[PDB]
């Protein structure tokens, strides 16, 4: 018997493939706990989920729960140092984060498996005795505000909050969850409110043990984990807080039958249809929501999306249930619009109700239900091993909704067939309770309303009774055929025997002029899956902006035409990735290896015999134009990274150049482009997973034979296989490129300190980056509060590497950069003052991060694929570079800094991208040289040397 524990669960149902061991238990204070033992893991992890979220914010203090979530990381009674947590994790190869939904606040971390307990103590202190330091508050409010301002110009966010603003204003749903400087500091100060003490009341009141779930994953035995969790979490007090429920829908009748005309930030065209539904959560065993969402959202032949696309009205459609809260959900149907579809919105919706009516006519179909059940069963049984962090987080989340023994299977396995529930939801989908939203720039100037928090321009209308009735009298329709049996359902899950000459690394099993084939039979995971990667090399992909555009449009048209067919396979766990690149095309095929050669053959066959459809052509090209235009509205740091890419790459076409050259792209010219693109090719492939060498060779030769047969493809010259170099900066040089964002009123910046990627250089850079990793965050954000987005680390491109800082701040870069340099000096000092053992802890942390084994096939394949597309082929890079990493001493790093990075360093290579805003104590900052301002990227690149290329392994 144990008094600290209320109950121990039964056997937790898991996949037969899952070797991890589980134990569920509820503590005396009512904390639901899942323990995961996995002796083979490198990183241990833990997560805690509170069942309180932004919907429980005080009406006078918006975002208090979010702010609290931020503040917990900044000191507790037992661990008072503001960054003890993040420093501990960083020093022990760990990371951490958290988030806040309307109903939940979820905290999570990972760390080296040998410091799991140490991390977990500090973690546990968050829910017992948090400090909420006043200085910490006055500072972090800036970080939260900056987070919000980041989201302000984001269309998705604006719409997200708009839906809340258009509902019952007295309903908690209408609350603004993020919070900012105004709502957290300014307004409360105006109203005498002591924020710290509001935070303490919220924590004390709502952070009760009875509203908490905990998941812990480690190498230790289940009994050890038990003892640990009991020890650290039995002291959490139970205040028996009643679980907040929201039975009343935020959308009642006068909020129904409404139209909303909305002005976006980007040039997009969208249609959002919404139905209020009850909370279907409790029916998870049958789940009508998925049923109707699968049908409505289906993209196969005979489908709604198929029809509406045939009329050239829409391009993409999503449909199904979206969650609201405990007491209410939604059922949405959203499409993107063409220029024509925008003028036929009513008709589109009528078609929607026609499809719905067709469903009502044919009723619930059990065979459909079983198809869903079996597919989910396969998915669950052969589910890839998750990263411990996201795993513990997810499980801690879903512990509040499901019985212990079912927490793993609950979201996957279906048991009950409920025609009644299906028909009931289906009955709730009717014009009398519909909400319609149009998002288009065509409403600019013609709106009469403004959303408070994001400043969204919109107009509300009542939908004419007449129209409602045309939609009620919706006929069923002959343009629609319900989906048939999915042919791509896998039947062969046999894991092929491991060959005698099988290699631990990808072997080069083909080296012809036509193709270079790398292969590996999976030795670790033993699933019935496979990954098939293909890099097609053709100089005509990126020879000029015109051909670049044509490549993009070619592959987009291809994918579009094959969507209807591929969707079945997608549902059946088999998906494909296809897109153009600076070097030519890229095509990956991932999933169950059973029907893979079928899908692939179809891909290549269609690829080589593609007949372009003109409607599709000019619609897609219009979309692409809008897209290029819409890069304008991207965030300042994305702008900075973009500009820097352009500066440091030998050959690169700007989006303005692309856009300009896009008008000259005619149908005959593209139709002429494709065969010349396919005329001469090279193919470097990586086939990895549950397949034999002979199978792999057969596949590669199948693709080659298809291309030769239908496109008369011939090999490419070896010398012709070009590669782009990186611009070489001069010693002690500083260059600055300046632009303006025009959309965000927020400045972005990237600082880049440039040699090539040799083992030594690599580990110098990476170790330094490790040492400064968390101090940079703590200094630039936690202390100085420059922005929400403060990033630092290695930059790798074209075989050449450097150290980058990226910041998105309210302040100007001419000052921001100064703060960065000052910080750099601070690091020069702290390295000289840190102990050799601390140094060795950084070394160890980085070593662990580098030696962390992948847990799923795709990750391994990703490592290999990196090694291949970089054309370095160092498959044993981890072992080699870690071995050399532990060789290093403190002053290898000291002279590295003093020679390459210091402000007066002899080989300092500094490039700064300054993206200005729309409208434009502390440490000692060093006096900087006068920068040379780039006023033309090409002239700049012509005036400078180009780096060499890394030699393979
Ligand atoms: O990504 C999720 O899991 C969430 N969504 C689920 C969904 O609707 N899945 C659809 C996907 C689909 C693709 N094409 C047709 N349907 C399905 O039934 O397969 C809902 C949602 C909520 C909030 C904002 C966006 C979307
Ligand atoms: Zn946040």
Curated annotation (Swiss-Prot):
Effect noted on mutating residue 454 to A:
Strongly reduced enzyme activity
Reactions this protein catalyses: Degradation of insulin, glucagon and other polypeptides. No action on proteins
Q: Does the keyword Transferase apply?
A: no
Annotated positions binding substrate? 294-300, 317-321
Q: Which residues bind Zn(2+)?
A: 66, 70, 147
Q: What is its main location?
A: cytoplasm
Pfam families to which the protein is assigned, alphabetical: Peptidase_M16 (PF00675), Peptidase_M16_C (PF05193), Peptidase_M16_M (PF16187), PqqF-like_C_4 (PF22456)
Cofactor (UniProt): Zn(2+)
Q: Which SUPFAM superfamilies match?
A: LuxS/MPP-like metallohydrolase
Q: What is the effect of changing residue 384 to C?
A: Increases catalytic rate towards INS and amyloid
What are the annotated GO cellular component locations? basolateral plasma membrane; cell surface; cytoplasm; cytosol; cytosolic proteasome complex; external side of plasma membrane; extracellular exosome; extracellular space
Coiled-coil features, chain-numbered ranges: none
Q: Name one GO molecular function term.
A: peptide binding
Question: What keywords appear on the UniProt entry?
Answer: Allosteric enzyme, ATP-binding, Cell membrane, Cytoplasm, Host cell receptor for virus entry, Host-virus interaction, Hydrolase, Membrane, Metal-binding, Metalloprotease, Nucleotide-binding, Protease, Receptor, Secreted, Zinc
The compartments listed are:
Cytoplasm, Cytosol; Cell membrane; Secreted
Top-level EC class as recorded in UniProt: hydrolase
Task: Pinpoint motif SlyX motif by residue range.
Answer: 810-815
More info:
ATP-binding induces a conformation change.
Q: Which family does it belong to?
A: Belongs to the peptidase M16 family.
Q: What is this protein called?
A: Insulin-degrading enzyme
Which species does this protein come from? Homo sapiens (Human)
Upper classification of the source organism reads: Eukaryota, Metazoa, Chordata, Craniata, Vertebrata
Identify the gene encoding this protein. Answer: IDE
